[PDB]
Design a protein around this ligand. Structure first.
Ligand SMILES: Nc1ncnc2c1ncn2[C@@H]1O[C@H](C[C@@H](N)CC[C@H](N)C(=O)O)[C@@H](O)[C@H]1O
Ligand SMILES: Nc1ncnc2c1ncn2[C@@H]1O[C@H](C[C@@H](N)CC[C@H](N)C(=O)O)[C@@H](O)[C@H]1O
Lengths: 318, 10, 307, 6, 309, 318, 6, 6
């Protein structure tokens, strides 16, 4: 909805970092002696309303590098705003496309690809699938922004959050379904049992012979105090380009950023834990060519049922 | 068949 | 009668094998759906393009025979919990393929192993298969009473065994089971097929096991003792365990080779019959309760409603 | 239902 | 040759006899009948055409491995859990079964012949190794030292009653059956990856090589402090290893990746090939020409390679 | 399962008529003078366990026309059985393909495409979608068997059927979902309030530049009994090739054929009818490139809610 | 389900 | 709602 985009555009940190990353990549790619002739083709996938397009234009202007901009969008309503922008200010410099990058056919290869599909967990919005689809029209020496993103997990105990998720008992649905779907929530009344550890990692462009996004991870968290594990908080850290990075992990949270809240993976029954024990958890990212879903289970100190098997409760429509 | 066929082994 | 079956992993031809098995008196045959040594790849270009059929067709048997006579086994080379990503992925794909084929044949039961401590990925794959389509094939997990690592002889110089009592160490196999069914959320389609082995654990361990949902019991032919007449027999502890299992209406699966070559393989099965008979006949209470065991029924309330 | 059950 | 009409389309074993004849064991891992067969070609080139086979026979069940017991004896491991010994006729035109025992449970994964030549060692998937006396036609001994399937065994070519055994339990045991507690646990001391194949060095005693799941061929010394030198030559598990008959043998390694690699003593990749379209199962050096390597895989091909020795 | 194919193969009428249609088509296509030199490419789509392949081979043999046969099948186990058949009996004449016809790229253009994807309702099993996907590799003069198929609806009153439908309450679901999905029933105990009328018609190959399967139909059923309407029974008819036809409609039911049962579309609430009061009903076939579903509602004499809107309670995955 | 149903 | 939630 339009309100979603309105709240999206409030954050200045994200777009400033995107502009800085662009600017730096353009400076690296276009040397001075070829400043006036080397025109870089830049594609903004999931342009939305313009913010990324405006950031790219500002970066090109401040870098004094010629660019040729495409803006791909599938949401027709956002396409209307993009076309109005292009007709009013951008002009012929920006070409707006109303399609899905996974099916669009660009007339020519692109030097740079800019996207902002990162979710709370950095892959719950199927950024890897869209970017892999887009890779087919990226130059062999092309760059992808973000070039890499990692998703981190950390056990958390919170009676308030457990009660809230228990209260999400929907009608005409499995009574235990609410415990098998992640929630994005501003963790306020909670206790973190251990420091987060990297869960998943994705990088673009992917040049390896095999391209698969099904992943399996195992994490062991030392525990130093008696407590009651209630769920797993999830954060992410993205390396836009070289040093330019965005992160919502508490120890490296980007100052002032508020565009993303941590994700929450609940577990059916609370797990009592004692100091000296280690919580061993396992995460699966599975896809069946039509859906992408997560499955998480706690193996130590006590086992728990696999949550959301076959995307029974929560799925992301591919 | 055999007598004591199932008798325990000693 | 006592439902008894035969476990074979080399079945050159189904027709003659089933004829021989039926002649010996067995009721069902446990066989591999795919050839045990026929490794298959799914992510390597030269291998994944393997031509020709992948296994013998189901036309060899009547649909009835598949649904009642055969029990599928998982191929030994499949290790879903391998440390290598490639091997793990190949094992996942192969196990899914074998389970789907077993469902396609409509096998009454499918036998999978639990020979190692960690079985999380295997449990995940099996659970995913269960929640996919509709099928009625039960799953039997082969869980030894004594872990293989503990049954090995003291032959290694640098890795000697220990004679410590290990009261908590005799239950490890049960733990393997307990975790697994916990991962699959106590699915009613998962059952145990415990393997007796040569030596029994502490009586408390057996009593604990008897509370689990045991559907089959694997008897290796190597555990049978030889009597003075050369026939196979069982020790007193084994006989008591067999009596207790018979009281649970378990399915016995004879596995291995005919060690008593002088006699016939049927000699093994006959012995079980001799144990089947001569057991304490059911009392009046047991006969009365027959048909109502582990069946939940609400209590009567004669005050409120009339009987 | 036999015994004392329903 | 009054042999079986056609082969089973999955070659499983190749062995060069000292005279130069090639023994080829095949099995049908797919289709209605899972049977096996053995063939003998006086001319390796003519293979695998069934019309030019010098001799042939069809086994009761599949053939997992085989070995030459001498100039006319063939020792074969069957999927039925049976170990069998066949003998060629005086004219070397018919393969006649001589002995066949079902002592092993499950399926015998591998078999080998000790240096003495009158004894053999077999390893089964039912956690067991067995030592047979072929002349006596009995099982001399039985051992259960592993906790998982016995992946491979390898007799010592220079010392009788000494052999390596590797299992899926990540143990490499050097059995010396002359003393109590023969198993020695001697190995690379690296439990990272499971072993998959072993090979004794023809010349150097107490020195051998082995392979793991990740296609890393490692050279180790029995009498050393588990010191090893390894090379990651294959992208898949090393199915087998063979040493050439040269005075300075080259190591021939075949892997599940469907590739062949001939390496020097320093494990440097001297030559490579990817002719096969499926798993490469076995390789063997032609005694007549030490630069000729004959390899057989499941693609139903016999590939002759000329190595730049 | 295997038993499903086994029960399918028990019907001789369907396969005999398929053989007759194939034989007539081969005779028409291949003149006598070209008998020795002309070879026709025939593709069996969804060959299953091979009964259609056997029918095609027998038809070619009796017609004495050379043919090269492909057998496309997506079910891996049916593929295993087909490959065993091909190795044992058919030989090189039959080439087995283990791929979905919509995604497969054929090496040759087919002269004839024979398929069986007819559910109780004509297009219940997405035969139109699969056949329009397969059309891309058909010759400009190619032939598609079945040539055409139509579906028929007829109002029915059945207290027993309504009671059984109402007894299909599945916990963990919308309470009134059972009434928004079709069932296949033998309709042994029922009253038919009018003769069936055509509902939807499909023909292949579809040379129309527009290629759409969304359909909307309205039906008027005179009533002469003054009873209560409980649902709609659905039958179908098909012309395989010219005269050769196969139907389950009561008036033209194929003799002996028992491979299909009439489908049942329930109504949420029984509707009383009088001697007049023509029953006006409306049917929609809708899709979204990922699912296909039916929506039906009765507008006369008394209106009723639209059933299964947006595939809310019953959909067929693409 | 004999016919055309589950 | 604000953040990244529905
Ligand atoms: N597969 C896809 N093809 C095309 N556009 C997509 C696809 N997936 C997501 N999108 C669009 O990507 C956009 C996501 C961004 N708007 C998110 C906020 C970002 N700051 C921006 O305004 O660009 C939405 O407009 C989506 O419609
Ligand atoms: N899109 C598709 N591509 C390929 N095969 C398909 C497709 N849709 C359905 N099928 C197959 O079509 C077959 C349907 C037929 N077997 C039905 C019975 C028919 N009398 C026969 O035996 O051919 C099944 O094996 C399906 O797997």
């Amino acid at each position: 909805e339009s309100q979603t985009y309105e709240v999206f555009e409030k954050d200045p940190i994200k777009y400033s970092q995107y502009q800085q990353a662009i600017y730096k990549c353009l400076l690296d790619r276009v040397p001075e002696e070829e400043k006036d002739t080397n025109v870089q083709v830049l594609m903004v996938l999931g342009a939305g309303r313009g913010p990324l397009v405006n950031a790219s234009l500002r970066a090109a202007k401040q870098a004094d590098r010629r660019i040729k901009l495409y803006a791909v969008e599938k949401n027709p309503n956002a396409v209307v705003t993009l076309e109005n922008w292009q007709f009013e200010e951008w002009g012929s410099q920006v070409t707006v496309v109303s399609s899905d990058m996974r099916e669009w056919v660009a007339p020519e290869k692109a030097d740079i690809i800019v996207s902002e599909l990162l979710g709370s967990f950095a892959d719950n919005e199927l950024s890897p699938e869209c970017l892999d689809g887009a890779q087919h029209f990226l130059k062999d020496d092309g760059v992808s922004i973000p070039g890499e993103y990692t998703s981190f997990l950390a056990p958390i105990s919170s009676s308030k959050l457990y009660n809230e998720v228990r209260a999400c008992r929907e009608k005409d649905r499995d009574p235990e379904a609410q415990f098998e779907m992640p929630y994005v929530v501003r963790l306020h009344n909670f206790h973190q049992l251990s420091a987060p550890q990297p869960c998943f990692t994705f990088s673009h462009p992917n040049r390896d012979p095999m391209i698969d996004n099904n992943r399996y991870c195992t994490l062991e968290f030392p525990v130093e105090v008696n407590t009651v594990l209630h769920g797993f908080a999830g954060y992410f850290e993205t390396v836009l380009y070289q040093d330019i990075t965005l992160s919502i992990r508490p120890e490296t949270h980007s100052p002032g950023m508020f565009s993303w809240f941590p994700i929450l993976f609940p577990i059916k029954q609370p797990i009592t834990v004692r100091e000296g024990q280690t919580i061993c958890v396992r995460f699966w990212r599975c896809s069946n060519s039509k859906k992408v879903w997560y499955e998480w289970a706690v193996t130590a100190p006590v086992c728990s049922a696999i949550h959301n098997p076959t995307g029974r409760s929560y799925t992301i429509g591919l | 068949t055999v007598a004591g066929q199932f008798e325990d082994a000693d | 009668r006592v439902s008894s079956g035969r476990d074979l992993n080399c079945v050159p031809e189904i027709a003659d094998t089933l004829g021989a098995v039926a002649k010996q008196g067995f009721d069902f045959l446990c066989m591999p759906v795919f050839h045990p040594r026929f490794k298959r790849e799914f992510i390597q270009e030269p291998a994944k393009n393997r031509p020709g059929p992948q296994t013998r067709s189901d036309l060899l048997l009547s649909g009835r025979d598949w649904n009642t006579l055969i029990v599928g086994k998982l191929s030994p080379w499949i290790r879903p919990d391998s440390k290598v990503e490639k091997i793990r992925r190949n094992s996942e794909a192969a196990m899914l393929q074998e389970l789907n084929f077993g469902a396609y044949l409509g096998l009454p039961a499918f036998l999978l192993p639990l020979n190692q401590e960690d079985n999380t990925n295997l449990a995940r794959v099996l659970t995913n298969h269960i929640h996919t389509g509709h099928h009625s094939s039960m799953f039997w997990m082969r869980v030894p009473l004594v872990a293989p690592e503990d049954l090995r002889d003291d032959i290694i110089e640098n890795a000697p065994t220990t004679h410590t009592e290990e009261y908590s160490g005799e239950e490890k196999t049960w733990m393997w089971w307990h975790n697994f069914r916990t991962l699959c959320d106590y699915s009613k389609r998962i059952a145990v097929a415990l393997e007796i082995g040569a030596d029994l654990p502490s009586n408390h361990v057996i009593d604990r096991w008897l509370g689990e949902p045991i559907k089959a019991a694997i008897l290796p032919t190597s555990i049978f003792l030889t009597n003075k007449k050369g026939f196979p027999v069982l020790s007193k502890m084994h006989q008591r365990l067999i009596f207790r299992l018979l009281k649970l209406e378990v399915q016995f699966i004879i596995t291995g080779t005919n060690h008593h070559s002088e006699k016939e393989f049927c000699s093994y099965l006959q012995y079980l019959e001799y144990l089947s008979q001569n057991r304490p006949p059911p009392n009046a209470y047991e006969l009365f309760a027959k048909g109502y065991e582990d069946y939940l029924q609400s209590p009567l309330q004669p005050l409120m409603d009339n009987l | 239902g036999r015994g004392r059950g329903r | 040759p009054n042999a079986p009409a056609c082969m089973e389309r999955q070659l499983e074993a190749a062995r060069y006899r000292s005279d130069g004849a090639l023994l080829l064991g095949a099995s049908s891992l797919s289709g209605r009948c899972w049977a096996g067969s053995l063939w003998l070609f006086k001319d390796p080139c003519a293979a695998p055409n069934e019309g030019f086979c010098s001799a042939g026979v069809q086994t009761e069940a599949g053939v997992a491995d085989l070995t030459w017991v001498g100039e006319r004896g063939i020792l074969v491991a069957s999927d039925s859990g049976a170990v069998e010994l066949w003998e060629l006729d005086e004219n070397e035109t018919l393969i006649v079964s001589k002995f066949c025992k079902y002592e092993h449970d499950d399926i015998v994964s591998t078999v080998s012949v000790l240096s003495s030549g009158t004894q053999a060692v077999s390893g089964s998937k039912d956690i067991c190794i067995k030592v047979w006396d072929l002349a006596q036609q009995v099982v001399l001994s039985s051992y259960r030292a592993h906790a998982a399937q016995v992946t491979c065994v390898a007799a010592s070519p220079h010392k009788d009653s000494v052999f390596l055994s590797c299992s899926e339990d990540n143990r490499i045991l050097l059995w010396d059956t002359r003393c109590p507690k023969p198993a020695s646990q001697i190995g690379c001391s690296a439990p990272g990856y499971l072993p998959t194949s072993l090979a004794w060095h023809p010349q150097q005693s107490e020195v051998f090589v082995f392979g793991d799941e990740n296609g890393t061929v490692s050279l180790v010394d029995t009498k050393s402090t588990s010191c090893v030198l390894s090379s990651a030559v294959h992208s898949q598990c090393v199915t087998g290893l063979v040493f050439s008959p040269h005075s300075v043998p080259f190591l021939a390694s075949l892997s599940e990746d469907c590739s062949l690699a001939v390496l020097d003593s320093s494990l440097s990749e001297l030559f490579r090939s990817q002719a096969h379209r499926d798993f490469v199962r076995d390789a063997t050096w032609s005694p007549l020409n030490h630069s000729l390597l004959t390899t057989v895989g499941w693609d139903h091909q016999v590939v002759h390679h000329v190595v730049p020795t």
